[PDB]
Each structure stands twice: as C-alpha cells, then as structure tokens.
Symmetry: D2
Subunit: 258 residues, 4 copies
Amino acid sequence: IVEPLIRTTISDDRGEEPRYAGYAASELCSKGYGIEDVIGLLWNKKLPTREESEIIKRIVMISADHGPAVSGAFGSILAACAGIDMPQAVSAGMTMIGPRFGGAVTNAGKYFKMAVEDYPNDIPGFLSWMKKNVGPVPGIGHRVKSVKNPDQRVKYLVSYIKNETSLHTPCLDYALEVEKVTTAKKGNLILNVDGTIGCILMDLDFPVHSLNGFFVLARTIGMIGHWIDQNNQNSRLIRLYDYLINYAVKPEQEVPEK
Amino acid sequence: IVEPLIRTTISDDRGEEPRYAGYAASELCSKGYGIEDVIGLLWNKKLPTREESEIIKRIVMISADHGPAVSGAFGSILAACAGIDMPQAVSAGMTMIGPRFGGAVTNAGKYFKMAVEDYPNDIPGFLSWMKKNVGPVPGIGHRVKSVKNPDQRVKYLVSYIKNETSLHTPCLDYALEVEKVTTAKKGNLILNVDGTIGCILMDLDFPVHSLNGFFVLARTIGMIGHWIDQNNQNSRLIRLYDYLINYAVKPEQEVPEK
Amino acid sequence: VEPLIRTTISDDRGEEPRYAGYAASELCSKGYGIEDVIGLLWNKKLPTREESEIIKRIVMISADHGPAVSGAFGSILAACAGIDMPQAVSAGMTMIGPRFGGAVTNAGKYFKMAVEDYPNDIPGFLSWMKKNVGPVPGIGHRVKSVKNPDQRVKYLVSYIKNETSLHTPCLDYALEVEKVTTAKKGNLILNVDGTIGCILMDLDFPVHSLNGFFVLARTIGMIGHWIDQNNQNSRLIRLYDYLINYAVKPEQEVPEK
Amino acid sequence: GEVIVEPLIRTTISDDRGEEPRYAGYAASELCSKGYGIEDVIGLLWNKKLPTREESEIIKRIVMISADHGPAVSGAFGSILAACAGIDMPQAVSAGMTMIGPRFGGAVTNAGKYFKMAVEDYPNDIPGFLSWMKKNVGPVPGIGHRVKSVKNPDQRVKYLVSYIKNETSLHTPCLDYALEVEKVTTAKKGNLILNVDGTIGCILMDLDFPVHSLNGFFVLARTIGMIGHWIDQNNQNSRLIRLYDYLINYAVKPEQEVPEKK
Ligand code: NA
Ligand code: NA
Ligand code: NA
Ligand code: NA
Ligand code: NA
Ligand code: NA
Ligand code: NA
Ligand code: NA
C-alpha cells in the first residue's frame, strides 16, 4: 500500500509546464500579468484585482532593503565575506526574520485588527491594554520621525491607497486614528511604515499567516543584492573588532585538579 | 581612527528613506516603476529600460515554482510540517539551491558568454570544447521535451524578446544556433528554460555571479507559498516511510568491553 | 566607543581561548572532557563528575535516530543536492523545534511545573495539561508500550537511580504519571524524550539551555548522514509523484486582463 | 495497476527500526553502560568504526580545543545576531553554522589535504613541496600566525604534539611532515609556525578519517560554542543589533531624482 507523504494544493509540474493555482506561467506572461499576480496565485490561490496588484507591487518595492546595517542584510554580508555561496548566505540572513526583525509588520496588523474588533471606539482602552500586557504599540513610534517630520513612505502609501484605489481599510483607518491619539502623549508616536504595511495587508484579505511573506520576499531582493555587492568587491572574512565587545567574562583561572 | 568593518555600494538608509542605487523607493513607486526595476537597482545598480524590465518580470514569473516534489520546495514543506516559522522554513528550502538544484542557469550563462567571446562563429568548436572540459552543455537537453514538442516557456521567452523588444541578445542567439546543431544529433537536445534564462540574463549585462539571484528570488515565492499551503492544511510532522529507505547497515553487534 | 554586544562565556584575546575563564589546553591536560566544556560554555560552571557522566550519556543517546526523521532527512536532502557539510547540517538543524526535538524541553518545563504546582495532585496536573496543553510531552510512543518497553528508558532510569546520587523530582514525577497513564493505554509510557527532559531539569540547567543537548547531539548524526551520502555519491532527490496528493486546481485558461 | 517501490535513499550508518537506534551496529545504551563516550559515538557515526582508547582521547581533545574562539568570529557572531533578533536556538545556531566553509574553519581541511599530498608526493622533498605550494596555492595552509612565533608558540600546538608523542603510540606521518616543514619555514620568517589549524588537520588525517569528514570536527565543536553564545545572549536579554553607521563605508550612489518612465 502507498499513502501519500504530503498533500499540495497550489502548484503542479506534472503537465506541460508548471501550473500556479491552475494557470500556466507562460500564459500569465503573455496576457500581461506580473510578479504580483504570481504572488497572489501561489500564496492565496487567487488572481489579484488590478488595485490589489498595484498595492502588492508598492509594498514589495518599499520593503526590498533597508541598508547593510540591519540584521538580515548584515547576516547575508557576513556569510558573503566568509565565502559562502548566494543561496546559503541569503538563508542565513533570512533566518534573522522573526519577532524583532520584520515582526512589527505582522504584529501591528494582528493587534490593530484586535483593536478594530475589541475596541472599535475605545482607543484609550486599547492603549491601556497594550501598556499593561504588551508594552509599546507595534507600528507606532519612530526615533527620528515625528508629526512635523512624517515618514514620506507612510504618506505615499496612505495617499496612494486612498486616492488611487477604492479599497476599504478598517485597520489602517484605526491606526490613523490612533496616530492622532498617540501623537498627543508624545510627538514621535507616529504611524510607522511597518504599521502602515501591516494594517494594509490585513485589510487586503490575505491569510494572517501569509503576511510575513511580503517582508521575507521583499528583503530577499536586498539580501541577494548585498551578497552580489560583497562578491563584486572581493570582500574578506569579517571579525568584529574587540573594542566593540564588552567582555564581561570570568577572570583567567587555573583548572582545578580532577 | 576606526577602519570601517564593511563596505556597501547598493543601498543607504541614513537619509529620509532608504535609497536603492541613489533612488528613493517611494519616488520609484510614484513614477510607475516596479519590482523588476528595484531588482535591477539593488543587484546591478542600473535602472532597466522598459523592455529589459518586461523580460526580468517574465523570468521571475516563469521561475516562481516547480511543484512540491523538488528539493527546495520539499525542504520548505518538511520544515513547515515540523512547525517551523515561515522565514526559517524557507531558509531551509533555499539552502538546497546550488550546483545541482538551480545551478544550470548560472552555468548556461557562463559558458554561452564564453562561447560568444571565444567561438563567435565556431559552434562546432564550442561544442567540442564543452565535451572535453565540461561534458553536457548546460541549458541543452530535456528528459521529455524534443524538437517536435518544445518547451512552451522557451518558445514564449525567445518569441517575446525577439518580437516585443529591440534588445541585442548575442548569448541567446548563440544558444538558438547551437540548438540547431545539437537537435541534429539527438532530438531531445533542445534549448531548455534554464539555458534560455541564463543566456537572456547575460545579454541584459548582469554579472555571472548574479544570475542565480533570479532563481533564488523567484523560488522564494513558491517556497513561501508551500509553507502557507501546509499551514492551511495543518499538516503533521513528516517521517519518511521505512520502505523508501535502503538500510544497508552493519549487523547488530554487542559492544566490546572497554 | 559603546560596545555593540556583551559576552560573558568566552574570550580569545589572551594566549588561547578561555571558556568561563579556563584554557582548553589546560582542561585537556587535567583529564576533563567534552561534557565539561559543555558545562563551562552553557552554564559557566565545571560539572561535578556525576553531572558529566549524565551529560555524556544524554548526548550519546541523542546523537541520531536514523535517516527517516526530519533533521537527518533534511541534511540528506541537502547532501544529495551537493551542498557542503556545514550548510547541509544547518538545513537539518532548522527542523528542530516544537515537533522535532521539542518534547525534550517541554517535558522538562511541564514536569517542573507539575512538581511545583501539583506536588501531590497528578490528576490536577493531567487535567490541567489536557485542558491547557493537550498531550503530555514525554508520555506516549507509537511502538513502545508496557508489552514492548524502551531499553534506553530502562537504562537511563536505572543509571540515574543505581549509579548516581542525584535527586530527580521531575523524573520521579514522570515515573508516577507513567503508572497512571499506562493503566489507561499500554503505549502511554515515559519515552526517551521525557526521560532526558526531566533529568536535565533535575540537574538545575537553565530552562532555555535544555534544547542545546538535543541540538548538539543530533548535529553528530546529521554530520554522519552528510558524510554517508557523500561516500555513496548520492544524486539529487525528487520526491516520487505517487507520494504526493496533488489536490490542485483544474487546468484553466488565464482570463483576459 | 500497483506501485512498484524503489528506495528513495540509501543509508549505511544508522538504523532505528530495532529496539533502539544502532550506530554502525552498536546500541547507544550499551555504549553508555560499558564506559564509552561522545567521542566513540563520533567515530561510529562518521567513520563506522569504534575508536581505540588512544584515538578516542585525541578526538576528545580536538573537540574541546575547537569548541569556541570567542564572540567576535563569524560563526559565534552569526548565532549572536540571530539570538538578539529573538530567534530560537536551533535556527540561530544554524545561521552561525552557515558561516563555516572555505574561509572560516577551512584551514583545518586544507592543511590536512596538502600535508597528506606532501607525504605522498614529496616524502623527503620539503623544498619541492614548498615550491609547488607557492606556485599553485600561495601560503601553506596550517603554517603561519600573525602574533605567535618561534619565541611565542601556540601552547595548544605544543600540548597536542606533546600529548600524541608522549601519551600515545599513534603514528602521525602528516603531523611529522608539518613539524619538519615548520623548521624550514620558521627559518625564513619567525612567525611561520605550525598553527592549531594545521596541527588538527594533520592529526585528523593521521587518524584515517576521510578528507571530507575533517570539517565535521570543527562544525560539531563550534556548535558547542554557538549554543553557549545563544544561551548567553538570552540570559542577558540583549537587544536587536544594528551595526553602527561609522563602521560602514557607504560607497553609494549620490541621492538622485528618479527619471520619468519612458
Ligand atoms: Na544603512
Ligand atoms: Na477606509
Ligand atoms: Na527554440
Ligand atoms: Na531508521
Ligand atoms: Na559539497
Ligand atoms: Na564540507
Ligand atoms: Na537494529
Ligand atoms: Na530553544
């Protein structure tokens, strides 16, 4: 007897060419569809509308990289400088994505949805519940940006989605109202790009556990770029400078007789 | 006083927003550019033309997934079924990409560029050198497809770039001429999709060591999809069936006294 | 000039690396072993001789479980794809988590919670576990049972009780639960994961270090499988189609955009 | 019809279908009860052979010496980066392990490879060996140290060589060859000593481990340290790491306006 080891629903390569949710890639190309549509097929088994496609495109472009200093890029750079090939080097950087690096996108969407359903018109109760049980509000706050120096990417994304699409964004609207409240207590408690993207993705009807995929995929663009960049330079193996390390170590000691 | 630890050329986040090869992502979005343009900027520090961008788009779409049975997808499925979160699960599948899984794109591009430079009008000489020093020509050959049943994705890509763009494609042209020679020897020695993509990328002036990025990035779309699919099904931990394993092990023996 | 990171366990600025203050060459010359270096780098304390003897056995017993489980099979898939050893083992290690290896840590965590919150209320523990967690980690086996006991559990429990002086409240608690659970169903035995998890908790190791023993031990096996496949010149793996349930969409034409 | 099954994979080293897992035919519980150790399980699973007591003592010392080299090197630092990003231990250690390869750890394998080739191709021709290395490789792997020299040798090398020659009967042709090479190279330049990577690489080759298994000792040993660093960072509740900007040479494009799409 032979029972299947796994079950798949999204793709199939047993036919003439691979099929994404029933559609051939070459036919998707010939009829004008794009990367964003293949994302919808493989992650949601649904061809996105044009307005959804334009938003997916912009989220990925905006999320593609944040410079070499952050953990995902720097992990890929460390591996590149150790002479590791591209896929394995990028896998090391991608391993950094989780609760602290990228997690604000998923978490902001998760809790701003919970606020929409459990505190529809009780923002102080939401902030109060967050203050006791979570701490800082995911998606709110910036070290440099403020009300009079807002994030241009948030401005653009909010402007594009409200002026160039007809999409209903309950979570984003809630976050935008929270921004009005939070900026009162402290001026730098703005809606940041992670909260904006996290709320928009929740409003686009993607499964909750797929939301991290947009950050993972986008930052893979940057991590590949950094691997290529380090290989273009013939970079050498990295050792962190000693003065950058607080060696709070035990004093040198003699091993006791066994 | 402090020698820099690393050098980066492709991106910077010290300004108002991240800059990709000098360009702000929000401004790229507002002026109609896409994911494919961000790929060109971060992997080659050059803005693609519209025709180049259309080709990059199609390469990523065609490469996004090849079903759950191949090593990259299956590695991500194994990790998903072990309860591993999406970024780490995809990183395990990505680790499978290398000389045997995905490697044909890079090798085809490398050797067909060498053919354009060392055998400009000497296809028999190129094929002769390949058999001596390499063996089979990467990008040539297919297990099922043949001259009278070619790969529809190759047909499409070659047709699109020939008829819908004015790009000069010496590597692709060389491969298409080689196809005439090899198919004259054996009907199934057609130009395959890996060879087509590898040659086109070289003709787009991407570095040889960047070619793999297109496969790594594209297959990340599918690996994310498979992770989502397995989580939608609540699949269980996988153990390979014993009848699928040839246990060519030592006979059980008693441990000798020490 | 503010430090980027802070470390407390090791230092290589001297003549040789120092593990919790001790030089490795000196540890070697005075008769210490791998288990002692584990204690220094994970707990900044030299183990007692009995602690080292237990650590040694836990690692030996956990080193491998055959090629069919997710960690080894992940390393084998990577080996057959031509990936080098460290990266191939990294793919197998990525499989270790709540379902593959996690029972060791969870058994330790919940049997500690039972010892402190239900010292003489096993039904309250079993009831609370069934309500809030589900199956008891470390209990149950698909093949082993009262009729087919586990030799490694027999050995480990026997070694602890007859060859050491260690007090093992967590392991003792699990052994009492085993008496209750096996009465319901013969296969609800204390398994090897539960045995090791309880012992590690009883040795006063930090709770978040417990997974290290499984991670380290199975790295031995994953390296072995990588070597084994490379000795055989194995080829790239593709899962057989008949092993996959393709519950996919029907082939469809793409709609005009 | 019915499916005709052909095995997907073949294994020779281990089997869990019996009463307990078998490592090259031996039960771990029985290995434990008869006094064997971690080093013996390493020998079984990587080489399908029970080590002798002296081979086991050498394996033990190699692993202990290789367990960690501080937090600044790439493997440890990768595990630290992932720990400070909140990643769980197995995945964090996997990120540091990904750094191990031709540049980080590779000197052990390269030293073993080329000093065995010297034993087989230049048995009594050290100058010929050095000449070939300069032409085809460059510096001799396992020779040289930036700080240590003949006046300040590596104590771990001294200890390992002393232990093997005074506390065991092992024949170490590769190690012996390297020790003679050291005499020639140190005459050229005082810091061209035999370093710990060359010592371990040669000893492992002399233990009859396959060349492609040599990296296993570094991978396994440094997993001990990488686990330790993950635990250490979690004990401290360290924060997400961002490399300071002044540590980065931003040789980037100037800020530019995006051209209109044509
Ligand atoms: Na930056
Ligand atoms: Na709205
Ligand atoms: Na053709
Ligand atoms: Na098995
Ligand atoms: Na390899
Ligand atoms: Na290797
Ligand atoms: Na057996
Ligand atoms: Na853990």
